[PDB]
Amino acid sequence: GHLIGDFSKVCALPTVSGKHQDLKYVNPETVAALLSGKFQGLIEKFYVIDCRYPYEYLGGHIQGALNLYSQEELFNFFLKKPIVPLDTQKRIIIVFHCEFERGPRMCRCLREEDRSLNQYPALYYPELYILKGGYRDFFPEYMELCEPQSYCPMHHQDHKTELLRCR
Amino acid sequence: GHLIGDFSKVCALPTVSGKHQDLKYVNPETVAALLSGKFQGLIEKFYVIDCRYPYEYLGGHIQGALNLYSQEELFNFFLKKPIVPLDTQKRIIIVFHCEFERGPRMCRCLREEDRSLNQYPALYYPELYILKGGYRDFFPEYMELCEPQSYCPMHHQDHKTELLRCR
Predict the structure, then answer these.
(1) B161 and A151 in contact by Cβ < 8 A?
(2) How far apart are the first and last CA of chain B?
(3) Alpha carbon separation from A17 to A27, A37, A148 (Å, rounded)
(4) Alpha-helical runs (H) found in A36-138
(5) At what angle do helices A103-116 and A71-78 cross, to 10 degrees?
(6) Residues of chain B neighbouring A140 (CB-CB closer than 8 A)
(7) How far apart are CA A96 and CA A104, in angstroms?
(8) Are strands A61-62 and A146-147 parallel, antiparallel or unpaired?
(9) Pick from A141, A153, A162: which is nearest to B161 by CB?
(10) CB contact under 8 A, A159 and B165
(11) A98 belongs to the catalytic site
(12) For residues A77 and A66, is the Cβ–Cβ distance under 8 A?
């Protein structure tokens, strides 16, 4: 469990363990590394995809993260016009995340869609990662890398929540 | 995986899944239930054991939780004078937790110590649970059940953190 979706390469990001064994999990440290330009010459483009609802996303997100929370939005961003690297020796990666159900199904969706458009084992996106513990585990460790520097938990019909922050 | 340490009964708390299969995990909802007196006549005594360091504990803990973070402290609290239920038909339970390494080893420690003091399969504490995701997952869902209503992340020598709260 180290080769990318098209079996051509090995994973570029130091992967860790998680709930589903079919998915390739990552940790806050590596996302922090990616953001500071630690992988140039190896990874050309990278996308942090916040699958939460806009209100959660607007209440505090990883700097530069895109708020794609539906299948249609995700297909239109990534598959309508596939992103191709300028330097083919370098890679294009996607890191998905949620708060801490909806998040891994987006990863599965993109992959199922990518497979149906290609002749096996080719993919427009062979490298897909999930941030372990989501925003709830990244925010406390890398606040200065969050925008705004707050955390808006998911709203629950049954129990009240509210925006977490500090000074 | 439902019988208690002495095999005499079944688990009283709705258990869920977690990292280690040998441990019996629980979720914020059930802890919230326990606290409101939802199990009287079934569970006589219960203990929430915060294994974090005092500074983390003082910066926000589950209401009524005890701050036992060392093996010696844990042995002196629970095994020096074992707690026995007034009504033997009712049970005595222990819910351990950390922030989100040190936490499950306390659960293992108490159990190893309890086994060495008894003749198998008897235990002073057959029911031990771990709160899944720790304080990081309970605080956002049940702030009104936290004291103070804040969260103090663990301090890291390498990266800065600070107290999370709201209004």
Answers:
(1) no
(2) 42
(3) 9, 24, 29
(4) 54-58, 71-78, 103-116, 134-138
(5) 50
(6) 136, 153, 161, 164
(7) 8
(8) antiparallel
(9) A141
(10) no
(11) yes
(12) yes
To 10 degrees, the CA torsion angle through B120, B124, B126, B129?
-140
DSSP class per residue in A42-66: TEEEEEEEE-S-HHHHHTSEETT-B
Q: Is residue A49 within 8 Å of residue A94, measured between CB atoms?
A: yes
The token pair at B74 is: 């844990």
* Nearest CB neighbour to B164, from listed A142, A159, A164: A164
Q: What angle do CA A20, A22, A25 make, to 5 degrees?
A: 65
Cβ contact (<8 Å) for A140 and B161? yes
Binary contact (A164, B133; C-beta < 8 A): no
Question: Contact A142/B159, CB-based, under 8 Å?
Answer: yes
Technique that determined the structure: X-ray
Enzyme catalytic residues of B = 98
Collapse the DSSP code of A105 into the 3-class scheme (helix H, G, I; strand E, B; otherwise coil) and give the result: helix
Which of A35, A164, A167 should we substitute to test contact with B (largest number of B Cβ atoms within 10 Å)? A164
Angle, vertex CA A37, rays to CA A34 and CA A40, nearest 5: 100
Number of domains in chain A: 1
Domain harbouring B41, CATH code: 3.40.250.10
Residue of B25, B159, B160 for testing the chain A interface, max A β-carbons within 10 Å: B159
Q: Output the CA torsion B130→B60→A133→A161 (10° steps).
A: 110
Q: Comparing C-alpha atoms, which of B126, B137, B92, B166 is closest to residue B24?
A: B126
